[PDB]
């Protein structure tokens, strides 16, 4: 019954064949076109060459479609080709954009990896896909995701496994893994992903690209496919992914227009504040080296310290700052928010389906009765506190206890804001989980989402920018990596981040709610100082 | 134990005595001041006379404090009494503002009517009180609320009963009743209320004043006292109340500033779009005469039709429009959203306290076990569907079922929006519940919230503007008033809205989320054409 994942596979195979035929019918027509020079152009220079008319939309489309087919052979990131494909005045006139599979597209599946969603095409484009087209953009591919989107790896029994473009044995991150892999190899100049616990930021950091997770309701979620609906405690956000920060900013400016506010009027009509983004006044930057929960890799720690020091040398003031009660925010707020019903609604999608090994024991753990969930919890507590706390907050609750939780989240949000205001911060610098874990390990290193999921729970703009790569000295010091807890998550993380020389390491930039243009201004500073030659 | 509501009453009495002493010490100092001419000034002319310096902030403060004490004697709306630093550059430089009790104020109680909150003063001002002060405003009084704020009447065992400034036997509306009563008699030029199911709109309509319920998160809720926290399905909103629409607009402009967005950055930094509010282009106005749930009073029906006709004569295009599945939105979405836990958290506030008669049987009904709630429900179903549906939706749920409900609310919101867009509307004209029910009746006419609670559930900006007054022709036709259901709610509403000649009747104006300046532009049109 779920064995008919072959139906999805032959569909994926047909998409790839259509791509290959289209690119080669174009390659024969334009033998004098310079592909190498075209692909290595930054999106800013690309769009103004489209807007002037120095490049045709056809040229840039099939050249990128060409690379996409080529990079897919080594990464397996493209699930289907959006076959049915522009307003001249648009800010993204000729730009091909890749989409995470959960972004619904007319006549195409959003099979989150589940057999349950297989023969179910979308009747309509989702709001963001509509505004992309209205702004000139050409959405061309659906990119791969882990089986339920609840994994920072990228594998499912339908379309298979996505691999990191830098190292085959490594994960591309998740859940926007296909996106990270494709943009990371230069197969796409821009892409859209979603993030409920780091799903834009993991793939960005692991594949060495830029990503932004805006405030939850800055962009429209109208028409996004998910496994569970109506969970509003931990905020889901969608945002851009690109090779540099200027591309993220241009994408946001394009999305934040009259078209987006007219379609789906539940989005606050906040235009892209150009004067904030283009600002160059010195910033008060809060920073932390470790969240005292997941121990940073020597690669992470070096990346964070060096970016801090360059910011100081630039003239910014750097202030030690750490959000209060992080263990609380993850173990009870975030874990309990995402699994208030004990995962009963989540488990509905898996009925009669295969469970991809990249999910670990999540499905097995969630299927346990509440009393057994509790019994194991206080049994593990003395030796393994983290495991016990997570087990306990993944139990079913009454609506009364959901209200208590939702109130606790808004209280925590205000307490961190009060903390932020007292220290008088503009932005916040955070370590980002990296280099990138081994192919099937993220599913058993859940604690590692600590650096990211915090700001979904807080609902703050959070962005990621690659600043350095793992040196052989960094990888050697992974041998003396001991966790804070020494539990199974620390053990697996130790062996998963090893054998990782040359892989990109990123840093995380945070701002207050609704301040994404300030967040981008800060991400631009980090990019400018750490990769001083990128344009 | 709850008997020490005398403690609250002697505190209220001391506040009143402090006011009286302050007013009289000022009146002796300024015997040549014209109080009558000062009080009858609209807020716009009042503020620009402050801003120029033709009036001192002292003059306008104690003149309004004076009226407040006077109108309180007949209305019982002031629960406690709250210049030398008032910032000159502020848009509300000298303006006295009245506050609903739930707005926390340093060193003062927010006893929502409950004994449980008696000896518990606030350690801090709430965000909106801070921004009012920073804008120059002077919050001067806390105004009365019904016992749990879950009533569109206005009575509690601590501070007593608030009465309508137009007719003593009538309710001022709720839960911002004290507010409505005070502004309705000219005791305050501006006030702040909250609205989770019509609690800005009821008191505004009942007392003949303007009110606006913005989109839930347009303003800050940071520091508001409530009975239940963390309920996010049906949206709570705070907004201004005033004698005209221009005062509402001026208040919003003042609140929507850098101070509000710096304190509580969870509020989207949307400044007051002046070009939308000051616009005078013709509007596509959707309208309905009845929600097919609560039958309009002849006074309501006449008010709606007349406003419709004047808008047409003005040059606006008027389109029949009614949100789909209203019975569903109230009985299952709104009722279930407010009572997902069966009212267990709500009932916590009442432990060992008196239950004010204005609450009706709410407390008794919510205290019943879930199985009995169910048993009564399908037993009532054949004869009284409304009562059955409400009873059933006020039962405890799992978190799983709350997720299903919250998903259904966002689905419904999108389906009404789709309805709105297809018809290509700018704004929506709706009947507003009125003239104003008898003193202890709102608590047993729950279905009457249908016209308001819908837009809390939808989370749309919704405003109220008085357009007419009940004629004796209208009051006579209440004898031929038969409901849609004929149940206890229709019976009580029939008797409750009668004997009501001369009372103000309002109309309701709605716009899409985040469009409160368009909503106010529409409210200004109705006010301009009807008054
Ligand atoms: C992308 O948005 N994400 C967020 C979800 N993230 C993961 N979350 C978990 C998890 C498991 C149990 C309790 C809380 C959180 N595992 S992976 C995947 C990437
Ligand atoms: C002001 O916003 N409010 C809220 C609406 N409110 C009332 N709600 C009810 C009620 C009772 C049972 C089930 C649903 C709703 N009665 S009055 C007036 C004060």
Q: Report d(CA A176, CA A464) in Å as an integer.
A: 14
Q: Report d(CA B439, CA B508) in Å as an integer.
A: 23
Q: Which residue among B266, B406, B513 sits closest to A266, beta carbon to beta carbon?
A: B513
Experimental method: X-ray
A449 within ligand 1 shell (Cβ under 6 A):
yes
Active-site entry in A11, A67, A100, A373:
A100
Cα-based angle B406, B233, A200 (whole degrees, multiple of 5): 60
**Chain A residue with minimum CA distance to B218:** A268
Is A450 known to be catalytic? no
Comparing CA positions, the residue from A244, A216, A132 lying closest to residue A460 is A216
Structure tokens at A513: 């709610």
Residue B338 alpha carbon, nearest atom of ligand 2:
14
Cα-based angle B5, B7, B10 (whole degrees, multiple of 5): 110
Range list of H helices, B2-99 = 6-29, 35-39, 43-52, 57-75
Q: Report d(CA B36, CA B13) in Å as an integer.
A: 26
Comparing CA positions, the residue from A45, A274, A221, A257 lying closest to residue A135 is A257
Please name every residue paired with B396 in a beta bridge, in sequence order, or none if there are none: B341
Is the omega angle on the peptide bond into residue A175 within 30 degrees of 0, that is, cis?
yes
Q: Report d(CA A265, CA A222) in Å as an integer.
A: 10
Please name every residue paired with B156 in a beta bridge, in sequence order, or none if there are none: B160
State the angle between helix axes of B370-380 and B385-393 in degrees (0 to 180), rounded to the nearest 10: 160
Is the CB of B514 less than 8 angstroms away from the CB of A265?
yes
Structure tokens at B29: 């100092």
**B155-165 exposure pattern, b = at least 16 Cβ within 10 A, e = fewer:** bbbbbbbbbbb
**Residue B134 CB neighbours (<10 A):** 18
DSSP B408-419: HHHHHHHHHHHH
Q: Report d(CA B389, CA A296) in Å as an integer.
A: 55
User: What contacts A488, CB < 8 A, 6 or more positions away?
Assistant: A384, A387, A444
DSSP state of B235: P
Structure tokens at A314: 């630039």
Q: What is the resolution of this structure in A?
A: 2.9
Is B124 annotated as a binding-site member?
no
CA of A453 to the centre of ligand 1 (A): 8
Structure tokens at A296: 């940073």
Spell out where A46-151 has E strands: 78-81, 96-100, 138-143
**Residue B357 CB neighbours (<10 A):** 15
CA of B174 to the centre of ligand 2 (A): 9
Q: Report d(CA B47, CA B52) in Å as an integer.
A: 9
CA of A117 to the centre of ligand 1 (A): 21
Contact A102, A80 (CB under 8 A): no
Structure tokens at A273: 């504040």
A446 within ligand 1 shell (Cβ under 6 A):
yes
**Residue A313 CB neighbours (<10 A):** 9
Tell me which chain A residues have a C-beta less than 8 angstroms from the C-beta of B270: 268-270
Helix/strand/coil percent split, chain A, to 5: 45, 15, 40
Contact B169, B160 (CB under 8 A): no
DSSP state of B140: E
Residue tagged 């599979």 (tokens)? A101
Q: Report d(CA A189, CA A148) in Å as an integer.
A: 26
Is the CB of B265 less than 8 angstroms away from the CB of A397?
no
**Residue B327 CB neighbours (<10 A):** 14
Comparing CA positions, the residue from B160, B158, B162, B159 lying closest to residue B174 is B162
Q: Report d(CA B46, CA B60) in Å as an integer.
A: 9
B-proximal residues of A, 188-217, CB under 8 Å:
217
Is the CB of A397 less than 8 angstroms away from the CB of B398?
yes
Residue with CA closest to ligand 2 atom 5: B197
Residue tagged 């006292």 (tokens)? B225
Comparing CA positions, the residue from B452, B422, B441, B250 lying closest to residue B360 is B441
Contact B384, A321 (CB under 8 A): no
A152 within ligand 1 shell (Cβ under 6 A):
yes
Contact A358, A144 (CB under 8 A): no
Tell me which chain B residues have a C-beta less than 8 angstroms from the C-beta of A267: 514
Side-chain-side CA neighbours of B191 within 13 Å: the count stands at: 39
Comparing CA positions, the residue from A135, A165, A152, A114 lying closest to residue A47 is A135
B89 touches chain A (CB under 8 A): no
Question: How many residues in chain B?
Answer: 531
The CATH T-level fold of domain B1-531 is: Amidase signature (AS) enzymes (3.90.1300)
Tell me which chain A residues have a C-beta less than 8 angstroms from the C-beta of B400: 340-341, 344-345, 396
What is the enclosing helix (H) or strand (E) of B98? strand B96-100
Comparing CA positions, the residue from B459, B333, B340 lying closest to residue B407 is B333
Contact A13, A69 (CB under 8 A): no
Is the CB of A407 less than 8 angstroms away from the CB of B230?
yes
Is A100 known to be catalytic? yes
| Domain A1-535 classification at class level | alpha beta
Is the CB of A403 less than 8 angstroms away from the CB of B268?
no
Comparing CA positions, the residue from B225, B253, B226 lying closest to residue B131 is B253
């Amino acid at each position: 019954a779920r064995g008919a994942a072959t139906r999805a596979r032959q569909k994926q195979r047909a998409s790839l064949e259509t791509m290959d035929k289209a690119v080669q019918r174009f390659r024969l027509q334009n033998p004098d076109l310079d592909s190498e020079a075209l692909l290595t152009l930054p999106l800013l220079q690309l769009v103004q060459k489209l807007q002037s008319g120095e490049l045709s939309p056809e040229a840039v489309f099939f050249t990128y479609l060409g690379k996409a087919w080529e990079v897919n052979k080594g990464t397996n990131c493209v699930t289907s080709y959006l076959t049915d494909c522009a307003p001249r005045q648009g800010l993204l006139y000729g730009v091909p954009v890749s989409l995470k599979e959960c972004f619904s597209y007319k006549g195409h599946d959003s099979t989150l990896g589940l057999s349950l969603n297989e023969g179910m095409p979308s009747e309509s484009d989702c709001v963001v896909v509509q505004v992309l087209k209205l702004q000139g953009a050409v959405p061309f591919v659906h990119t791969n995701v882990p089986q339920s989107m609840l994994s920072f790896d990228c594998s499912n029994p339908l379309f298979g496994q996505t691999m990191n473009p830098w190292k085959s044995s490594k994960s591309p991150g998740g859940s926007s893994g296909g996106e990270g892999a494709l943009i990371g190899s230069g197969g796409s100049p821009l892409g859209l992903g979603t993030d409920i616990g780091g799903s834009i930021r993991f793939p960005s950091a692991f594949c060495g690209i830029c990503g932004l997770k805006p405030t939850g309701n800055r962009l429209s979620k109208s028409g996004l496919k998910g496994c569970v609906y109506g969970q509003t405690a931990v905020q889901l956000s969608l945002g851009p992914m690109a090779r540099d920060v200027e591309s993220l900013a241009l994408c946001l400016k394009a999305l934040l227009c009259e078209h987006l506010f007219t379609l789906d009027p539940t989005v606050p009509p906040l235009p892209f504040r150009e004067e904030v983004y283009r600002s160059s006044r010195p910033l008060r930057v809060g920073y932390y080296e470790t969240d005292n929960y997941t121990m940073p890799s020597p690669a992470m720690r070096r990346a964070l310290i060096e970016t801090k020091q360059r910011l100081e040398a630039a003239g910014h003031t750097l202030i030690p700052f750490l959000p209060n009660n992080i263990p609380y925010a993850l173990e009870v707020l975030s874990a309990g928010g995402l699994f208030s019903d004990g995962g009963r609604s989540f488990l509905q999608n898996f009925k009669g389906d295969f469970v991809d090994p990249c999910l670990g024991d999540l499905i097995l753990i969630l299927r346990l009765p509440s009393w057994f969930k509790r019994l194991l919890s206080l049994l593990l507590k003395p030796l393994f506190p983290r495991l016990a706390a997570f087990l306990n907050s993944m139990r079913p609750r009454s609506a009364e206890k959901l209200w208590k939780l939702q109130h606790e989240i808004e209280m925590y949000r205000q307490s961190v804001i009060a903390q932020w205001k007292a220290m008088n911060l503009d932005v916040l610098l955070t370590p980002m989980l990296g280099p990138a874990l081994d192919l099937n390990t993220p599913g058993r290193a859940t604690g590692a989402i600590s650096y990211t999921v915090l700001y979904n729970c807080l609902d703050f703009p959070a962005g990621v920018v690659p600043v350095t790569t793992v040196t052989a000295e960094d990888d050697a010091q992974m041998e003396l990596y001991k966790g804070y807890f020494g539990d199974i998550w620390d053990i697996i993380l130790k062996k998963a981040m090893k054998n990782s020389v040359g892989l990109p390491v990123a840093v995380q930039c945070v701002a207050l709610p609704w301040q994404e243009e300030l967040c981008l201004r800060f991400m631009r500073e980090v990019e400018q100082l750490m990769t001083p030659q990128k344009q």
